[PDB]
Amino acid sequence: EVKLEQSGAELARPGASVKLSCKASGYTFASYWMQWVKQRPGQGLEWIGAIYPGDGDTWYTQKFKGKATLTADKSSSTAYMQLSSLASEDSAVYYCARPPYYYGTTYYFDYWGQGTTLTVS
């Protein structure tokens, strides 16, 4: 059973930072890239960046370059994202999601994590 598990919430002080975790299972972790998406109520979904776990190569959304750092631990099958200098606008639900891309067309996300509610206050 393919699964991406995250922890339900994080409460953080403004100006501080957090390391969100996302544990994978049910598949060869290094075989697929890992994506991170941000969802604010009413705003919708926003893509933060992705990382290939096999070599650690990252690609970021210009908007989050310098706010989010992605890493992974191929030993424990966990992917990570650190968010720094948080402010009220950073409050949201953060998802890690997997992308397949075969067929000759889109990287269509096929598996999403349970999501982590982060609150800055």
């Binding site: 919708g44 979904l45 893509w47 210009q62 067929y103 067309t105 996300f109 999403w112």
Partner: protein, 115 residues
């Protein structure tokens, strides 16, 4: 970055009616090479995370009822629900997964009229 726009922002319909919602992008999502458009549709029911409904512009994902049909090409895409059911209540998002940034449209919120 490719900008994705969706319309309408919300729609309210009673069970059994047909709905049409659109997603245009500001740049083509079609390759010049394999000829496929890199656009997916996700459904997010209240209180749940988004779930992949359709990928390529048109392949419906297994589990997804055939009342949902994705269509369109290039910059203009459509998701149609042939006869809407109460369980289709959701926000529908389209997404470019052509290239990074992967970006998403703002969503069409589908609401349900009833007795």
């Amino acid at each position: 970055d490719i900008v994705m726009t969706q319309s309408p922002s919300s729609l309210a319909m009673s069970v059994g009616q047909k709905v049409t919602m659109s997603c245009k992008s500001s740049q083509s999502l079609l390759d010049s090479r394999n000829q496929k458009n890199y656009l997916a549709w996700y459904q997010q029911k209240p209180g749940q995370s988004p779930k992949l409904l359709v990928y390529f512009a048109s392949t419906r994902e297994s589990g997804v009822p055939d009342r949902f049909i994705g269509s369109g090409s290039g910059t203009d895409f459509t998701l149609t629900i042939s006869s809407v059911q109460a369980e289709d209540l959701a926000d529908y998002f389209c997404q470019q997964h052509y290239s990074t940034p992967l970006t998403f449209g703002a969503g069409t919120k589908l609401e349900l009229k009833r007795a």
